[PDB]
Structure formats: structure tokens, C-alpha cells
Design a protein around this ligand. Structure first.
Ligand SMILES: O=P(O)(O)OC[C@H]1O[C@H](OP(=O)(O)OP(=O)(O)O)[C@H](O)[C@@H]1O
Ligand SMILES: O=P(O)(O)OC[C@H]1O[C@H](OP(=O)(O)OP(=O)(O)O)[C@H](O)[C@@H]1O
Ligand SMILES: NC(=O)c1ccccc1
Ligand SMILES: NC(=O)c1ccccc1
Lengths: 464, 464
């Protein structure tokens, strides 16, 4: 990895574009005004990409050679980079101040700021925009996941009177449906801020290496079938597949994909009659989890519950909602995103089924079907020093007021009523508003403040 | 990287779920029935992740300890992985056959097949489903990028009579808007199958390492401003910023973001009047490229053109369309995806503006706003051998015939009319359709067939 090759190409040319005699460029990241965002993932970038000796004689040469061909021109700032190598032993003269990871912050507030700490390095502040803005991704995943958790909490509370098991209601199925191995780990770690169930194993090592938990692991799974492990038995032997599988995993939870041929037949006749005897004998700690995987997600879930309720003893909980026996549950893991998840719990509630009965698995909806656009994650220069004079800078495009950026030096504060406010134009120095919530997390090649994954989970808790 | 920890959790439990005495699991990947897909990206995965000694004693131990905690139970196949280490020095006993990279294939056809080459490693075929299915991403980027090339080619030909400069008409802006560094390199590389313009520098090294080009680099850029390099001059000094930047880059093309305060004022008054003398003097190979970045993309592009058309000498080309002078161009880099690109070129054509005048930059639309759903990329078991008996396996969910999978051993063939057909149930062996178009690209830890990026580009060409 070479930081000199980890920027947008045009930024290579920006050192020649700033006003002459500029000693300071100061920039900030916000999710421009999903009303509130979980700030998560910066610590990963700081440690993996930004800290320590990130410049070498070899990396400068490599970059020089690539850019000469990429631009067909000599534009690369070799002197600037060499200056960092010789004076700071290749450590970046940058200070980054950030809100604590896990914090839940309303849109349109500063989340972190970046400035250069040596006047020679005015151009470096925005060199690293590209790499830092990629924080949009863990922010957005953590945020969207938490939003699903609110929906789940609401309906679980209403239909059952408590939140037991909430942490296990939205399982990460996204490993194959993301764009890379690196994304898999990042995105899976962001979902674990809110939940504990994951099949995206890559999340575990990222968390262990960059954040840390008191528990051996941040996330957990159970045995579960796929179509290959059912269909391999042959079309006439789905029942043999089911029987083999539940018997192999008789004393832990086991999920069994039941739609290879006919989900409704599988529920009513295979599980509901042929194999009923192997299900009703199961422990509460070791249920059968039936998994539909096709059809309209709402129609399929409701029809499956209807079938099961006629084949197995249903109770009615203290809230008046129907509850399957504790050895039998359902997981819907097809076509699940925040919208369909809402439609399913609502449809269940309508038909008087407790949310205790259901869990969800989500792949692309959880980890891939998200864009920098969703929270308007944006990094802009708000302050420069030119000829020893600070000036407040911003954009304000005529046709789009939503793209107006903030002016001057920024600070984030608690308001008297307990909300958040971003003070502009260095007004935080007036001290009318208690201390700045941003803390120095990076300074001159060193990570200066870290959060464990346990702290982050606490910071990102739901209200209730 | 540890391949033992690079699968979906549930797959760790699958060795215990297949029928007893299963000696072969054979699986295939398709983009289930955007009618044609560019096959691209498998070779990256084969080389980075799958080839060579990928199993060590330390990797087995690491995986054992993680899964013990992750499952709260000892499901992990330590013996199976140890077998591979001991018998094959950690090389995967797997055969992969694939269509050549860059090939453009209709949906619903076999793109690659995976099978185990040792009876003991029957569980390995689908272990690596998760890693291989991630090929959806380069496939989808390359396909969506090529679909945009078809639109640009159509309108450039209609409005100008040729395709000169087509390969520079869609510029990759997506480095900051993807989910990780790895994703950036992969996705930028896929766009470069079709185009030559990129700011996602990560794509360059990937191609050089994994594919190779005759040219020193596969992609190119030019100097360009961002809002920090305009706004840093102070709101009253936008003109000074503009003058400085174009003079710094007076003999190469330069893109200058023009909407910091008022895009229409910048075009009409600043470029059109105050600084006009510094633009009309420029070379045909060093145009000023004016960049709007806000507002309704179509309305903004049309108004920008109307403004410039009144300030600069417009000509009418041989097709009857309006053409700006060669030292002046426009690039629309905001809100660009396949739909808005189509809207802009059609609206331009409608108002009699040649597509010669316009280029596009696309970020998330190009590299992030894409999902496994778009092409229905899917991996499924189609054939197994159990008790020495080969059987054709498949899924066929009652509520979704689209998800029916293919049966038996598969082959890809040319039809008598020269189209593509995938033969099922080993029927390729009858030789009624000539030889299988898939080639063995991986066998027993080795990459056995490779393509340079130049071969891939040639395979991926448009009809014209
Ligand atoms: O985030 P998503 O992309 O929605 O992932 C969830 C889906 O993934 C798996 O199916 P598979 O990989 O076989 O895809 P398919 O169900 O569409 O065939 C799983 O059995 C779910 O159907
Ligand atoms: O295709 P996209 O993913 O949108 O990327 C392209 C956009 O990215 C940059 O803006 P910035 O990073 O400031 O985003 P913003 O214009 O939304 O603020 C650029 O100046 C374009 O507006
Ligand atoms: N555990 C599962 O059922 C699962 C299915 C598909 C993808 C990931 C996980
Ligand atoms: N070169 C550019 O104008 C650009 C803009 C935004 C993102 C990447 C590149």
C-alpha cells in the first residue's frame, strides 16, 4: 500500500492551485442535512492507512513513475513528499479531531476535522480526503443497521412486551454480495455495532485487530443448510436431507432452507407430519429454524406461519399475539432490506403473530445496497490561512442550497436542551456552550485516542 | 489472509450435511435471466486468494480457535483442512473452468464451473462459493460501464458521424464513493475494460499486477480543480482562482469546477468575458474543460451550453449539430449514472448540441450503486457423485421459476447461427454443438490459463 497512490488523480495537481502563501488548509466531514448517524470506522482507516512511516524513498519514486505516464506530464509534487520523508521520517504532519466512535449525531453536524500541522504541508489536508471520505461506508452500514434495530425493537416490544433476543434478530448474510474481501470485513464490523449474529466471518478479525472486545468474539453463528446440502440428496429425498441435518445438529440451533422445491409442502407435510417427531423433541436452546428463501417475502412469511400454526401447538402470549412452540422458529433471508423488514413485521402484527417467531437474514440490503448519497457524506475545506490571515471559506452553489458548506473553524457541542450544535467561524472559542465534543484522534503520524468495540456498542445503544 | 476464514459461517458446517459417500460436488456460476454481461474479474481472485499454498498449520489453528468461539461448539473440519495441507502441501484440489475474460455473453449461460479433484474434498467446492461469487462485482461494473459506452457511441455517432474520443467520454470519479480501497482497485479496473479516463488511481496497480498491458498504464487523467482550490481564494476572488489555475496548466487540458457560488455567472461573466482572452488562446490539445457540479444535471448542462454558445464562436458540424470551439469543453460530473447519462445525451441531441461537446464523470453510479441483484449472479450445485453414482441436481422453488437452476454437467457452445447456448446434463459430450467454450483456468493450486488486459479489452469491444 502506497499513500501517494491512494488519492483521486486530480488531487496530485492541487498543490499548484491553492492561493500562494497559504500555510493552512482546514477541512471537515459531515453527513449533510435517517435523521441521525452512527459515527464509526475512522479508527480502522487511521491505523491501517495513515499512521507511522507512510512515506519512503521507494514510494515517492514509484508514484513519480506512475504519474508521469498517467498524466503524460511531470505534475507530481516530489518536493512536498520528500519534505515529509526527510523532516518527519515519513510521518504525516496532520491533526484529526473526531467525535467519539459509536456516537449518534443528528445530520448536518461536524463529525471530524482535518488540518496540516506544518505550513509546508498545506496541500496534504485534502490529499487524504479520498481515503477519509470512505468512512461513509461504515457510518452508513452502522446507521442503516441501527435503523432496522429500531423497527425490530418497536414491533418486538409491542407484540411481546420485551426486547429479549433483539441482538440476534438481524443476521448478516452479505459476505458474497459485497464488492470485495476488504468491504466484507468493514461492513460486517459496522453491523456488529448493533447486533451479534453474523455469517460474514471477515468482520471478526477486523474488530479484534483494530478495536477489541472483552469477549473472545464480537459475533456468532449457528449451523445452517444451503441449497447444495439439500438438493445434493436428489429431488425425491428432501425429507432424507432434512432428517440427516437436524439429527447431525440435534442439540444446537439449526437453520434449514426449506424452499428448494416447494416451501409450503416442506412446512405442512415434511416438517409438519413426516418429521414432526424430530422437531417437537428439541430443546428451547436448540430450535429448528425453518428458512424460506423465495416468493414475495411478506406473503411467504405469513403463509409459512399459517401452515406451522396448524401443525404445531400455538400459544397466545400476554400481549395477545400468537407464539410458536420454543423449539420452532422462522428466518426470512431473501429480499430483506430496511423497507421489506418493516413490511414483514407490520404484516405479522396485523395477522396477530408475535415478532418473537421471526428473525431476518440480510445480504446486499445490509452491506451493499448503500451509497454515499444516502447520508450525503461530504468533506469540504472551511478555513485557510493565507499570508498569516485566517479566512472562512465555503461553497454555496446557486441551484442547490443543500450543498452549502460550513464556514471557518468548527466545534461540536451539547445544547442546553441536550441536543447537538456545530458552531462555525471559531465561535466555539467563546465558550458559551461547554466543551467541544471533538477529540484529537490523530496527530503527526500517531493515533492519539482509541475506542474499544465495547465502548462503541455502548455509545450506539438505542434509547428505549 | 486466511481462506479458512473467508467463507460464510454456515459453510463451515456443510461437510456434515451432504449425503454420505459423496465424492464429487460440481457447481456453476451464471447471471440468471442488461441482456449480455462482460465476464471479468475471476483471474484477480484466482491469483490473489486461491493459488499456491493457501493452507498452513497456523491458519488451521487460527480458524479452529475462532470457530470454537463463533459457534460456541467444535463444528470446524480440522481433519479435512489438514488432509489438504498434508496431501497437497496446502494447494486446493479444485478444478475451475471459465469463459475467457472480456467475453460478452447473454444472460442465463454458464460462466464458470468449480469441482473438487479429490473425493475427500467434496466439501471444498462450495466452501469457496463466497469468495468466487464476489466476481459479481467486476462483472457488473464492466457490464454497466459497457452499457453506458453503447449509449455514448450511439449519440456521438448520430451527432458527429464518428466515435473519435469515445474512450474518454466517461471518467471514473468513484474512489471516495466506494466501500473500500480493495473495491476501488477492482471496480476502477472493470471500468477500464471499456474506457481510458480515470481518477481512481488504485485501478492502475491492480491491472499491472494481475492482467498486464502493452502500454505503461491502462488509464489516464488531466489536471482538475476541486471546490477547496477555488473557494480557498475567498468568495470575492473566484476569478483570481480561475486565472491562476488555467495559467498553471496552460498547455495541458484543465478541468475547472465552476459552480462554487454561481455556475451561470462563472460561465457568462468570468469565463465568457473577464478571462475569455485566456481561453480563446488555448490549444486544441489543451482545452479548458468547464465543470458544473450541482443543480438538475440535464437543465444545468443545457443552460451552460446555451451560455457558452453565446460567448464563444460556435460552428455547425457536417451532421448539422452545434459545436463549441476546440479549446472549450464541458464535463458533467454530478449525479451521473446510466439513466441520467441517457437523459443528458438525448436532451442535448434535442437542442442540436453535438455529443462532441460533453464528457461525463461518474462516481457512485459507476462503482458503488450496484448490487448482485442487477444481473442475478448466482452459484449453485448442479451435479454430484454419491456411492459412485452421478446425479443431476438443481433447485426449482415453487413460487419463483426465475430461481430454477441448471441440471448436471454443463458446457457452453456456439449455436449454428453463432449465438450462445449452455448444454445441460452432460449433453455437450454428444458433440452436436462443437467444442465447449470454457477453458480450465485453475487446477490443483495452479493458474493454468490467463489473459492480458489487452486481450480482455478486445473481447469486450462494442459491435461497431
Ligand atoms: O443480500 P442478498 O444479495 O439479497 O443475499 C441474501 C440471499 O443470498 C442467498 O441466495 P443466493 O446467493 O443463492 O442468491 P439467490 O437467492 O438470489 O439465488 C440466500 O439464500 C438469500 O437468498
Ligand atoms: O458520482 P458521485 O458518487 O456523486 O461522485 C461525483 C461527485 O463527487 C464529488 O463531490 P463531493 O464529494 O463534494 O459530493 P457532493 O457534490 O455530493 O458534495 C464531485 O465534485 C461530484 O459532485
Ligand atoms: N446462514 C445462512 O442461512 C446464509 C445463507 C446465505 C448467505 C449467508 C448465510
Ligand atoms: N477530476 C475530478 O474532477 C474529480 C471530481 C470528483 C472526484 C474525483 C475526481
Amino acid at each position: 500500500f502506497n499513500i501517494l497512490l491512494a488519492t483521486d488523480s486530480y488531487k496530485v495537481t492541487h498543490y499548484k492551485q491553492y492561493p500562494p502563501n497559504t500555510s493552512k488548509v482546514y477541512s471537515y466531514f459531515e453527513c449533510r442535512e435517517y435523521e441521525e448517524t452512527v459515527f464509526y470506522g475512522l479508527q480502522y482507516i487511521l491505523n491501517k492507512y495513515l499512521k507511522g512511516k507512510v512515506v519512503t524513498k521507494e514510494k515517492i519514486q514509484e508514484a513519480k513513475d506512475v504519474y508521469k505516464e498517467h498524466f503524460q506530464d511531470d505534475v507530481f509534487n516530489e518536493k512536498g513528499w520528500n519534505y515529509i520523508l526527510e523532516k518527519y521520517d515519513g510521518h504525516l504532519p496532520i491533526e484529526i479531531k473526531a467525535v467519539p466512535e459509536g456516537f449518534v449525531i443528528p445530520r448536518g453536524n461536524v463529525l471530524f476535522t482535518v488540518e496540516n500541522t506544518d505550513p509546508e504541508c498545506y496541500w496534504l489536508t485534502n490529499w487524504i480526503e479520498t481515503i477519509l471520505v470512505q468512512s461513509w461506508y461504515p457510518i452508513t452500514v452502522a446507521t442503516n443497521s441501527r435503523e432496522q434495530k429500531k423497527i425490530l425493537a418497536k414491533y418486538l416490544l409491542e407484540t411481546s412486551g420485551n426486547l429479549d433476543g433483539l441482538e440476534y434478530k438481524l443476521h448478516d448474510f452479505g459476505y458474497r454480495g459485497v464488492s470485495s474481501q476488504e468491504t466484507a470485513g468493514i461492513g460486517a464490523s459496522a453491523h456488529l455495532v448493533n447486533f451479534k449474529g453474523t455469517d460474514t466471518v471477515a468482520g471478526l478479525a477486523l474488530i479484534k485487530k483494530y478495536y477489541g472486545t472483552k469477549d473472545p468474539v464480537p459475533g456468532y453463528s449457528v449451523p445452517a443448510a444451503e441449497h447444495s446440502t439439500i438438493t445434493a440428496w436428489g429431488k425425491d429425498h428432501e425429507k432424507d436431507a432434512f432428517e440427516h441435518i437436524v439429527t447431525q445438529f440435534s442439540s444446537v440451533p439449526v437453520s434449514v432452507v426449506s424452499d428448494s422445491y416447494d416451501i409450503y409442502n416442506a412446512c405442512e407435510k415434511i416438517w409438519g407430519e413426516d418429521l414432526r417427531h424430530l422437531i417437537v423433541s428439541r430443546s428451547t436452546q436448540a430450535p429448528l429454524i425453518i428458512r424460506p428463501d423465495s416468493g414475495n417475502p411478506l406473503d411467504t412469511v405469513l403463509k409459512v406461519l399459517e401452515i406451522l400454526g396448524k401443525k404445531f401447538p400455538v400459544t397466545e402470549n400476554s400481549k395477545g399475539y400468537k407464539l410458536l412452540p420454543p423449539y420452532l422458529r422462522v428466518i426470512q433471508g431473501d429480499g430483506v432490506d430496511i423497507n421489506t423488514l418493516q413490511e414483514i413485521v407490520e404484516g405479522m402484527k396485523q395477522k396477530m403473530w408475535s415478532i418473537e417467531n421471526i428473525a431476518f437474514g440480510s445480504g446486499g440490503g445490509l452491506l451493499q445496497k448503500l451509497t454515499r448519497d444516502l447520508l450525503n457524506c461530504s468533506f469540504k475545506c472551511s478555513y485557510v490561512v493565507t499570508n498569516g490571515l485566517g479566512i472562512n471559506v465555503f461553497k454555496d452553489p446557486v441551484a442547490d442550497p443543500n450543498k452549502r458548506s460550513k464556514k471557518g473553524r468548527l466545534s461540536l457541542h451539547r445544547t442546553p436542551a441536550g441536543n447537538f450544535v456545530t458552531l462555525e467561524e471559531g465561535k466555539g472559542d467563546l465558550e458559551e456552550y461547554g466543551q467541544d465534543l471533538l477529540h484529537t484522534v490523530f496527530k503527526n503520524g500517531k493515533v492519539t485516542k482509541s475506542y474499544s468495540f465495547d465502548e462503541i456498542r455502548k455509545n450506539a445503544q438505542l434509547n428505549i
